[PDB]
Enzyme design. Structure first.
Site, mmCIF file in Angstrom:
data_model
loop_
_atom_site.group_PDB
_atom_site.id
_atom_site.type_symbol
_atom_site.label_atom_id
_atom_site.label_comp_id
_atom_site.label_asym_id
_atom_site.label_seq_id
_atom_site.Cartn_x
_atom_site.Cartn_y
_atom_site.Cartn_z
ATOM 1 N N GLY A 117 0.878 -0.984 -0.116
ATOM 2 C CA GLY A 117 0.215 -0.084 0.103
ATOM 3 C C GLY A 117 0.806 1.177 0.164
ATOM 4 N N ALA A 118 2.216 1.300 -0.129
ATOM 5 C CA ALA A 118 2.934 2.310 -0.254
ATOM 6 C C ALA A 118 2.775 3.158 0.981
ATOM 7 C CB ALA A 118 2.758 3.047 -1.443
ATOM 8 N N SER B 280 4.835 -5.355 -1.999
ATOM 9 C CA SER B 280 5.236 -4.044 -1.923
ATOM 10 C C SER B 280 5.784 -3.441 -0.789
ATOM 11 C CB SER B 280 3.864 -3.550 -2.387
ATOM 12 O OG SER B 280 3.908 -2.260 -3.443
ATOM 13 N N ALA B 281 4.900 -2.536 -0.116
ATOM 14 C CA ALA B 281 5.274 -1.872 1.145
ATOM 15 C C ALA B 281 5.290 -3.109 2.075
ATOM 16 C CB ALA B 281 4.279 -1.040 1.492
ATOM 17 N N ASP C 23 6.273 -5.737 -13.455
ATOM 18 C CA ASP C 23 5.940 -4.886 -12.111
ATOM 19 C C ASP C 23 6.284 -3.248 -12.419
ATOM 20 O OD1 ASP C 23 5.495 -5.419 -9.384
ATOM 21 O OD2 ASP C 23 7.231 -6.705 -9.127
ATOM 22 N N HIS D 242 2.341 -5.179 -11.297
ATOM 23 C CA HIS D 242 2.545 -5.146 -9.773
ATOM 24 C C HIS D 242 1.639 -5.583 -8.857
ATOM 25 C CE1 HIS D 242 4.727 -3.406 -6.291
ATOM 26 N NE2 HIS D 242 3.753 -2.836 -5.866
#
Length: 515
Positions: free
Chosen positions: A107-108, A194-195, A313, A428
């Site tokens: 979720g960055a 990701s995050a 990605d 991604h």
């Protein structure tokens, strides 16, 4: 064979049992268990006082106070430190000594939940398929994201990193209590995308997790990603203050009004894939994260690690940076690309940018097909944002291993029908659904091959969880995944067609352009 009520440091909990009836087996499900006292803006998580009687763990609790996609409203609540559990069961007896897999959502560092997005009555972050198909326990949970989770100043007044300490608290809780649910406290595997990937990575690197993590998996994200560590927190700190009505001269004072400010006010004090635009993320605080991630790999010396990435990605972000890469009537100059690499400038001044540029175009002059220029912009995004940092991380991990084994994978399975031709592959986060068994939980919304990719992934993921060897465990496998080493920087490429050729060699260990 059910578990009934379970004892935990905070008191007794009780979830629900669900016979999964493929016949014989079932699964106990706990949703809402708290692993930390309700949070207070910009204040480290604190243990939970506990409770009396038995707690009904039957419903997911709100996510953390964050911004809506339209980033004009807010959902969740500062009281989100709740974890959820899935314990697979059978007739023979309640499971015990099971490998525990803790998940950390991407979720960055701006949004996300422990129950994640959801498709018609079934959720995104639901360990049921994983728990049952790999015979392991799954743990999902919420952690402070956005301003409330990472707002900082680069100083002790507002050191930052709350979201990571939330994560540390959840990992610690599972450590201290999971045995009561049938898990092996000495076999905890963290995994995330990701995050979540960078967080799973960051966790393995913090001296705070000493003796908690046995294994870890990073999917499309590691600590070495350029979007993971904020090099200037003080800046974003002032921007927020001004907006919520505070001064920007005295840090101590700024951190004061900023700490009692309406939590929601802080949350929505700034817009937001320009690398440029994400700011409220982890920061080298000299405490939780003692130094630059690159110099901490020694802390992960005895933590088996699997790090991978998706073949497509970067595309998603590339599409937003070079909008023209898709439109066929429009084209990408030589300027555009240079202006791009120049914005990922970590070596200001003519030299560097020119260097990297000439690099990602070595055969641009021998094939300036708009197809090759754009195929370059995508990979550059891919290499910069994900693949290079992952390649360096793996390098650093093996280079510091003692007991720890290291693995690399490339995920290239296309989930839909390629929209754009022979740019085939996985975008991604495309990897999440096959990992969580989506194709199996909602079979009619998928193809028989998708179920094939998911099966292989769960098999590998859970095997690895159990023995630290993707190849060994309670589940069989299509190809032998070979351990990454200096002598062979190999990586397994995941697809529907999987055999001996799946193992690929030649992962980069020398980095032109970046590092």
């Amino acid at each position: 064979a059910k578990l009934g009520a379970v004892y935990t440091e905070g008191g007794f909990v009780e979830g629900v049992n669900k016979k999964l009836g493929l016949l014989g087996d079932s699964v106990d499900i706990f949703k809402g268990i708290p692993f930390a006292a309700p949070t207070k803006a910009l204040e480290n998580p604190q243990p939970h006082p506990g409770w009396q009687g038995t707690l009904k763990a039957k419903n997911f609790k709100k996510r953390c106070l964050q911004a809506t996609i339209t980033q004009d409203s807010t959902y969740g609540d500062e009281d989100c430190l709740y974890l959820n559990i899935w314990v697979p069961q059978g007739r023979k007896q309640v499971s015990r000594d099971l490998p525990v897999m803790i998940w950390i959502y991407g979720g960055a560092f701006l949004m996300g939940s422990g129950h994640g997005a959801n498709f018609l009555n079934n959720y995104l972050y639901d360990g049921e398929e994983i728990a049952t198909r790999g015979n392991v326990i799954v743990v999902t949970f919420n952690y402070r994201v956005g301003p409330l989770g990472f707002l900082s100043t680069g100083d002790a007044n507002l050191p930052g990193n709350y979201g990571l300490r939330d994560q540390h608290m959840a990992i610690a809780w599972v450590k201290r209590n999971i045995a009561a649910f049938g898990g092996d406290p000495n076999n905890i595997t963290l995994f995330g995308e990701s995050a979540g990937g960078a967080s799973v990575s960051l966790q393995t690197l913090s001296p705070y997790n000493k003796g908690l993590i046995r294994r870890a998996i990073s999917q499309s994200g590691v600590a070495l990603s350029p979007w993971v560590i904020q090099k200037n927190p003080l800046f974003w700190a002032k921007k927020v203050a001004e907006k919520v009505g505070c001064p920007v001269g005295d840090a101590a004072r700024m951190a004061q009004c900023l700490k009692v400010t309406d939590p929601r006010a802080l949350t929505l004090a700034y817009k937001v894939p320009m690398l440029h635009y994400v700011g409220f993320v982890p920061v080298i605080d000299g405490d939780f994260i003692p130094a630059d991630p690159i110099n901490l790999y020694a802390n992960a010396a005895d933590i088996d690690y699997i790090a991978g990435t998706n073949n497509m990605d970067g595309h998603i972000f590339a599409s937003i940076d070079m909008p023209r890469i898709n439109k066929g009537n429009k084209k990408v100059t030589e300027e555009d690309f240079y202006k791009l690499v120049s914005e990922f400038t970590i070596t200001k001044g003519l030299r560097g940018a020119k260097t990297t540029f000439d690099v990602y175009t070595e055969s641009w002059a021998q094939d300036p097909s708009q197809e090759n220029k754009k195929k370059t912009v995508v990979d550059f995004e891919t290499d910069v944002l994900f693949l290079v940092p992952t390649e360096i991380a793996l390098a650093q991990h093996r280079a510091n291993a003692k007991s720890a084994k290291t693995y690399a994978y490339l995920f290239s399975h296309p989930s839909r029908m390629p929209v754009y031709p022979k740019w085939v592959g996985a975008d991604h986060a495309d990897d999440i659904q096959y990992v969580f068994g989506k194709p199996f939980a909602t079979p009619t919304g998928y193809r028989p091959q998708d179920r094939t990719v998911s099966k292989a992934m769960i098999a590998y993921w859970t095997n690895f969880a159990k023995t630290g060897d993707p190849n060994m465990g309670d589940s069989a496998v299509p190809t032998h995944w070979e351990p990454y080493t200096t002598e062979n920087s190999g990586y397994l490429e995941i697809t529907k067609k999987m055999g001996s050729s799946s193992m690929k060699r030649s992962l980069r260990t020398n980095f032109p352009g970046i590092h």
